[PDB]
Ligand binder design. Structure first.
Ligand SMILES: Cc1cc2nc3c(=O)[nH]c(=O)nc-3n(C[C@H](O)[C@H](O)[C@H](O)COP(=O)(O)O)c2cc1C
Ligand SMILES: Cc1nc(Cl)sc1C(=O)Nc1ccc2ccccc2c1
Ligand SMILES: O=C(O)c1cc(=O)[nH]c(=O)[nH]1
Length: 365
């Protein structure tokens, strides 16, 4: 499409050449929140509809956590064409995150490295922001456009489990699903919460708090995991998920690895790497987690999705829904319709009646 080309070849490179990545992001969030977006001409066909997590999703392509950290651009994101929106991570108290600069573009690799460290307006601010549009969201969700809330923990928190529990109590009633983010590489000690005993204890508390919410305000609970886990880690996560009845998994967060072949000058910056070099590592993690959970636990696949083929590979590997973030940084808003259009075409070409038929298809061949 003309829009795709204009954004890819002209607008985005100009934006990028004029502003550092954090400023560019702040501006993108502002424009999104004002609905200043190119025409999402793409109409979602029935083939793209998915029913999972106790909800209908008009299409399976969502915006990943981190773009709208504080819940400021939710409606603009649906307008962009996303079938669902996840905000966060939100921490219990407000916090500034790491010192700048803390995000870096690797254009030669179509990758980003970030070390934001959970900059967050905090639960109270986000709660009021979501309450101000709560009934509009109730109608969106009913219409097949659900909202997810991703929870983090404060840097100085003594008790991680209580941080997450507070998030469940405060934002749980405003969310269709909650994400327990235990996979940020930018908060010290956080990833150790993926370990079997820590995870079991943490998630038992989270699920207890969730179950204590009134029925119409009771969200699904998902756990978002790293792409850098050992086989033992993945086995243990699968075991805990099945033991506790966790509703789903988000696979994956950014990687602390630096795959061979990265060309960007900034490849050795500390932080999580996202984008294209993450793609197949993420897809393989989805494939493994789907097998370990016997295809019975919904997976949202995320990491390096920039095309319909990327989306479909994750869906065939076992993802019921997919998310993207970094591709937006390079291709802008037209990438969303592009992914949906290509995905629909590929589903038809490969003989699937719809997205639902393709979920986990690789494991049945
Ligand atoms: C700048 C930036 C900030 C992010 N912040 C969060 C976050 O706060 N919580 C979270 O769970 N994931 C966060 N992520 C990870 C994304 O949600 C996603 O898992 C990861 O970037 C891989 O997807 P992608 O390759 O499409 O970007 C962030 C990613 C980036 C690039
Ligand atoms: C389309 C448009 N009209 C005016 Cl005026 S400014 C503007 C505009 O620049 N919109 C953008 C550009 C890039 C983006 C990247 C990510 C997310 C949202 C984005 C919105
Ligand atoms: O805030 C962060 O730095 C952040 C959190 C997260 O979950 N993933 C990431 O790449 N960065």
């Amino acid at each position: 499409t003309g829009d795709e080309r204009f954004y890819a070849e002209h607008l985005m490179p100009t934006l990028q050449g004029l502003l550092d990545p954090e400023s560019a992001h702040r501006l993108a969030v502002r424009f999104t929140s004002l609905g200043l977006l190119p025409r999402a001409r793409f109409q979602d066909s029935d083939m793209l509809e998915v029913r999972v997590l106790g909800h209908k999703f008009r299409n399976p392509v969502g915006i990943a956590a981190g773009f709208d950290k504080h819940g400021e651009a939710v409606d603009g994101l649906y307008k962009m064409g996303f079938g669902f929106v996840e905000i966060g991570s939100v921490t219990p108290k407000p916090q500034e995150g790491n010192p700048r600069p803390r995000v870096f573009r690797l254009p030669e690799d179509q990758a980003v490295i970030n070390r934001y460290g959970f900059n967050s307006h905090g639960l109270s601010v986000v709660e009021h922001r979501l309450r101000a549009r709560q009934q509009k969201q109730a109608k969106l969700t009913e219409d097949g456009l659900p909202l997810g809330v991703n929870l983090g923990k404060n840097k100085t928190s003594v008790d991680a489990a209580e941080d997450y529990a507070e998030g469940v109590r405060v934002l749980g009633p405003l969310a269709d699903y909650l994400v327990v983010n235990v996979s940020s590489p930018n908060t010290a000690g956080l990833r150790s919460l993926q370990g079997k005993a820590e995870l079991r204890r943490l998630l038992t508390k989270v699920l207890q708090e969730r179950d204590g919410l009134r029925r119409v305000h009771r969200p699904a609970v998902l756990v978002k995991i790293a792409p850098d886990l050992t086989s033992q880690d993945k086995e243990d996560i699968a075991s805990v998920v099945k033991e506790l009845g966790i509703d789903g998994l988000i696979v994956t967060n950014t990687t602390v690895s630096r795959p061979a072949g990265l060309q960007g000058a900034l490849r050795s910056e500390t932080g999580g790497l996202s984008g294209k070099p993450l793609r197949d590592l993420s897809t393989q993690t989805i494939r493994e987690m789907y097998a370990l959970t016997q295809g019975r636990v919904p997976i949202i696949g995320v990491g390096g999705v920039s095309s319909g083929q990327d989306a479909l590979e994750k869906i065939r590997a076992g993802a019921s829904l997919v998310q993207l973030y970094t591709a937006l940084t390079f291709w802008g808003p037209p990438v969303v319709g592009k992914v949906k259009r290509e995905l629909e075409a590929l589903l038809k070409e490969q003989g699937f009646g719809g997205v639902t038929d393709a979920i986990g298809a690789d494991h049945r061949r």
